[PDB]
Design a protein around this ligand. Structure first.
Ligand SMILES: *[C@@H]1O[C@H](CO)[C@@H](O[C@@H]2O[C@H](CO)[C@@H](O)[C@H](O)[C@H]2NC(C)=O)[C@H](O)[C@H]1NC(C)=O
Ligand SMILES: CCCCCC/C=C\CCCCCCCC(=O)O
Ligand SMILES: *[C@@H]1O[C@H](CO)[C@@H](O)[C@H](O)[C@H]1NC(C)=O
Ligand SMILES: *[C@@H]1O[C@H](CO)[C@@H](O)[C@H](O)[C@H]1NC(C)=O
Ligand SMILES: *[C@@H]1O[C@H](CO)[C@@H](O)[C@H](O)[C@H]1NC(C)=O
Ligand SMILES: *[C@@H]1O[C@H](CO)[C@@H](O)[C@H](O)[C@H]1NC(C)=O
Lengths: 43, 49, 98
């Protein structure tokens, strides 16, 4: 629910924008963006 | 079919890096860009003929 | 969307010039190219950030038919380093064009 800095971890660890990341060793490696409201399938 | 073929002929590279003139001018210096664009010009003229 | 991380790549080109017997400036093949230091070396540089920019810094020196560059280039022997496309599908000056 909050932006995570590069090579960092979530600070506070429900309703609002969600920022998605790829984690390798508990640290943010790639930023994927916000979750769009119209996701219908993930392959 | 004739119009369809004429329209689809615009995707031919004609031995160039790209079929988009804007991409060529955004990726290359003008001296090389002109040489790249000349091939597309010739191919499109042949298709029109 | 992506992370923001910018890297500047400075390429240093040291040129050697001389005067030929016909009165024309000749650029020596002993000119040196220096890349930013990476992994304890300065000959290969790979981009490891999301965004990058490229810059060229040129220096000029002169010798007298002895490959001993110890004097600054004069008005006749002054030269500037440039990078041309060659065989690449893109030019160096267009690398900063997204
Ligand atoms: C490019 O670098 C080379 C060395 O890699 C320089 O050649 C040396 O020059 C010094 C004096 O600056 C001499 O004492 C050495 O004997 C030279 N070494 C060799 C192997 O020739 C060269 O001068 C540099 N070129 C320019 C234009 O700066
Ligand atoms: C749920 C875990 C993975 C989430 C990944 C989210 C990252 C990027 C999403 C990009 C936008 C997708 C848009 C799909 C098209 C549409 O909006 O209909
Ligand atoms: C995200 O959730 C945590 C835990 O409830 C909360 O402390 C924080 O304020 C939230 N952040 C935002 C931007 O809403
Ligand atoms: C992962 O991070 C931990 C600290 O959170 C560190 O001790 C460990 O060495 C890291 N592992 C790798 C494989 O880098
Ligand atoms: C490259 O040179 C510029 C000035 O031209 C300087 O500000 C910058 O820090 C240099 N980059 C590196 C990585 O040293
Ligand atoms: C790089 O070289 C330095 C000395 O210049 C040395 O201390 C260091 O260990 C080297 N790095 C390596 C081997 O990863």
């Amino acid at each position: 629910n909050d932006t995570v800095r590069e090579s960092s971890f979530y600070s506070y660890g429900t309703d609002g924008p969600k920022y998605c990341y790829v984690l390798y060793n508990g640290t943010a490696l790639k930023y994927l963006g916000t979750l769009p409201p119209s996701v219908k399938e993930i392959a | 079919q004739a119009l369809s073929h004429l329209t689809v002929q615009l995707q031919n590279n004609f031995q160039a890096i790209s079929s988009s003139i804007s991409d060529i001018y955004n990726r290359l210096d003008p001296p090389s860009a002109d040489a790249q664009v000349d091939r597309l010009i010739t191919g499109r003229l042949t298709a029109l003929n | 969307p992506s992370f923001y991380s910018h890297t500047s790549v400075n390429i240093t080109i040291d040129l050697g010039m001389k005067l030929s017997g016909y009165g024309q400036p000749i650029a020596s093949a002993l000119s040196n190219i220096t890349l930013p230091m990476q992994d304890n070396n300065t000959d290969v540089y790979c981009i490891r950030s999301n965004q990058f920019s490229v810059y060229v810094h040129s220096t000029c020196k002169s010798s007298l038919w002895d490959n001993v560059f110890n004097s600054d280039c004069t008005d006749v022997l002054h030269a500037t380093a440039v990078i041309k496309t060659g065989t690449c599908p893109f030019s160096f000056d267009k690398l900063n064009n997204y």
